[PDB]
Design a binder for this molecule. Structure first.
Ligand SMILES: NC(=O)c1ccc[n+]([C@@H]2O[C@H](COP(=O)([O-])OP(=O)(O)OC[C@H]3O[C@@H](n4cnc5c(N)ncnc54)[C@H](O)[C@@H]3O)[C@@H](O)[C@H]2O)c1
Ligand SMILES: NC(=O)c1ccc[n+]([C@@H]2O[C@H](COP(=O)([O-])OP(=O)(O)OC[C@H]3O[C@@H](n4cnc5c(N)ncnc54)[C@H](O)[C@@H]3O)[C@@H](O)[C@H]2O)c1
Lengths: 311, 306
């Protein structure tokens, strides 16, 4: 079996490619152009181990400036994770990389026999919801990111209905752990704690949110390929084991580091409904925040203060 | 009050400029780049009346290639109708004119004190539905037009929530009447009947749908401005008086023309707009009958292709 992962040098793509290659039957092609919020310097480390694997092929090209028929020959499964995640005149890159990229990939998949086109989307499509967020909820995105990613999902349905591209949509809720993007909250809090600085906190930080450890996110993503259920056409939430406030997270980080944080200071309560994923994917997130945060803490320590080839 | 109408030379925008200018209090600025399926001459035809009026200013420029800070200086209300109606390389124009236009327009309005930004959208955002279509249904667009128009609506919510742009979304169901675009079904059917050619139907023509006469469309669009109720942030379906199938419509066109048509069939049975919300918030009640509306369109099409 041969699998294309778009955005394979990114946070989630780099872990997915590695989880796929544990199956000695799987061959992976990753494509990544090294753009978006993570600098290329920091990003190179994400694929260090990946490029040691003989069954991994890496292409450093823009999806919009590459031979797609060539990239897609002999591909059984596409995992599409390439995106600009996380305004003004900054808007064009979101349209180019979240809408035009998805449309051009889907166009090139018409002339191709895929088992699955697994399109990765985001909980930012939903906008604001108190309580359980389920896949039947009317999406009202409140960011440019959310708007352009939801547009990507809608193109998946257009190409499924019109040309029978076997699309699956996974909506990831906040994913954290080793390799988390530097623009994301846990990375920023941990780097501030390591540097004895004030921890930036927007609002009073008691609002509780859903968080998914990378390894739980990746098990759910792999199960989208390996499930015996018919999931073609479905939208599936992939969300976390435990929910926590930004003040709970800092509590657990102070326990981890044995430091104390100079805190520098919107539904109260929201979580992913993961019942569709439980039923269709046997998905069950198993990693605790305390284990997950320890692993992210050690990663960020080594990233900025260490001497690894990926420092 | 000074009102910017985008797409002001188009089918609906030209009628809208006409109705607003009836109010002596209202000054109207129209911008239109003369693109999409309608030829330029028909659009010059659409605004021939408006240009004579001293409270009307017209700009023939791309919204993406104009000084929007100049354009919006003393504007109290935006009516945003500018758009491209409905693969591979033909996709960028939908993204440019339905997504980027809306984003740049909203960006230019972010820091201005508008009373209202009235964003015009489409029932094509809903995708395939059976029965009454209300604003709470999950939109699953099936076309690039639908996706790009749906993205425009979502940009409005982004700018409402973050910058308090006072947005109102109207979802038009199919609009017909004089100046209907030449790509649209009634325009095409009437033209074919005038030439005694077969009337081309796609499908078996028995699916009944919602049609809105342009004057009823404009009355609801003006009510979105003039209503005493707070409708900021609301999505409102604007739909029509009578439901008809294309076979119902052709039978009425036969009554107008006094002759039987040859019917040419090439390649979801019942669907209508739920206009409850528009009734309550806009006192919208469409009053023009299909037979009266089709007569008005028929006369407009005949004067073109005599
Ligand atoms: N990190 C999260 O918590 C989270 C949450 C919700 C959804 N997601 C989604 O998961 C996916 C991966 O997110 P991430 O956090 O790993 O992001 P990331 O930025 O680390 O990875 C995205 C990668 O896509 C690549 N890319 C973008 N445009 C490209 C193009 N035109 N051609 C080739 N490569 C291109 C970038 O170089 C980058 O390496 C995205 O689709 C994102 O929207 C992530
Ligand atoms: N006609 C219908 O039945 C119908 C149905 C539902 C919704 N709508 C919506 O109503 C609005 C008007 O539709 P219409 O039938 O009058 O179409 P139209 O093509 O007659 O009018 C739209 C006008 O927008 C202008 N325009 C497009 N892009 C522009 C740009 N970048 N800069 C400047 N001007 C630009 C075009 O030149 C055109 O004259 C659209 O937003 C459409 O999606 C119409």
């Amino acid at each position: 079996m041969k699998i294309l992962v778009t955005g394979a040098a990114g946070f989630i793509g780099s872990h997915l490619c590695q989880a796929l290659l544990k199956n000695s039957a799987y061959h992976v092609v990753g494509i990544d152009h090294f753009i978006g919020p993570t600098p290329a310097t920091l990003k190179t480390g994400n694929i260090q181990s990946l490029e040691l694997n003989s069954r991994f092929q890496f292409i450093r090209e823009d999806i919009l400036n590459t031979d797609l028929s060539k990239l897609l020959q002999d591909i059984d499964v596409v995992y599409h994770l390439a995106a600009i995640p996380g305004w003004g005149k900054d808007f064009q890159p979101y349209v180019t990389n979240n809408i035009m990229v998805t449309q051009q990939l889907l166009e090139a998949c018409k002339h191709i026999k895929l088992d699955k086109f697994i399109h990765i989307s985001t909980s930012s499509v939903y906008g604001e919801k108190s309580g359980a967020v389920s896949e039947d909820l009317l999406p009202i995105p409140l960011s440019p990111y959310g708007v352009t990613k939801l547009s990507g999902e809608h193109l998946c349905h257009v190409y499924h209905k019109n040309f029978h591209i076997p699309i699956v949509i996974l909506r990831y809720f906040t994913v954290y752990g080793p390799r988390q993007r530097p623009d994301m909250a846990f990375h920023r809090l941990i780097k501030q704690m390591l540097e004895d600085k004030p921890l930036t906190i927007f609002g009073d930080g008691t609002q509780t949110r859903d968080f998914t450890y990378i390894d739980d996110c990746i098990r759910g993503t792999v199960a989208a390929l390996e499930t015996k259920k018919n999931i073609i056409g479905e939208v599936i939430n992939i969300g976390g084991k435990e929910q926590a406030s930004i003040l709970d997270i800092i509590s657990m980080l102070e326990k981890i580091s044995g430091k104390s944080a100079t805190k520098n200071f919107e539904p109260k309560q929201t979580w992913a409904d993961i019942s569709k994923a439980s039923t269709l994917l046997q998905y069950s997130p198993t990693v605790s925040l305390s284990d997950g945060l320890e692993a992210e803490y050690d990663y960020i320590k080594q990233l900025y203060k260490g001497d690894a080839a990926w420092s």
